[PDB]
Amino acid sequence: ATFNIINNCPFTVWAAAVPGGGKRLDRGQNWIINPGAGTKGARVWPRTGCNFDGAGRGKCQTGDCNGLLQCQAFGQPPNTLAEYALNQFNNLDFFDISLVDGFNVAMEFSPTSGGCTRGIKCTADINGQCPNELRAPGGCNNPCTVFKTDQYCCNSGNCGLTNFSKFFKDRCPDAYSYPKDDQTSTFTCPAGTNYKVVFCP
Structure with missing residues (x-):
């Protein structure tokens, strides 16, 4: 699996x-990555508002990963997420866009190879429309991040759409709006598919 990560936004994005x-x-500009076979728990995300020194150390306003340009860790919300697990189940990759850790930049996450033709987009003006309760510098947090309750965070295994997840879900129906938003947010492609993640598609 190759991922081509492309910035189509009219501002610098630190993939x-x-x-x-x-x-x-x-x-x-673009960035091609080649995660190992069977990679799981994986993410691609945009970061905005970054200042890095020449060694790649500093800080991003959104999606910062321990102050590094070269992330080895997940980012600080809000950050729009491309999530994937290669060869997750029955020879299928499972992939999704998640807003569970908020939104910063619009995203497409789609296959590029001919064996898979359905992808995912989230392109609404979530930052402009973000509920004031959810706003954060550079983005729009999920209510789980903001309020940290079971209702939003699903730790108990029960939860559903809420007013604040619905904000996201109405705008990006194909993305996870809350942790258990699986039924309408899980995409698959045959293992061996290649993908693109496009910021501001």
Whole structure:
């Protein structure tokens, strides 16, 4: 599996991936990663508002991963997430866009190879429309992050759509809006598919 991570936003985005690291992308720049077979628990995300020194150490306003350009850890919300697990189940990759850790930048997460043709987008103006309760510098947090209750965070295994997850779900129906939003947010492709993650598609 190859992932082509493309910045189509009219501002610099510091792509991040675990596994993969990170890369500063001006508009139109891309970054190709090649996660190992069977990678799981993986993410790709955009970061905005970054200032890094020449060693790649500093801070991002959104999606910061322990202050590194080359991420080895997940990012600080809010950050729009491309999540994937290669060869997760019955020879299928399972992939999704998640807003469970908020939204910073619009995203497409789609297969590029001919064996899979259905992908995922989240392109609404979530930052502009974000509930004031959820706003954070550079983005729009999920209520689980903000309020940290079972109702939003699903630790008990029960939860559902809430007013604040519905904000996201109405706008990006194909993305996870809350942890257990599986039924309408789980995408699959045959193992061996290649993908793209596009910021501001």
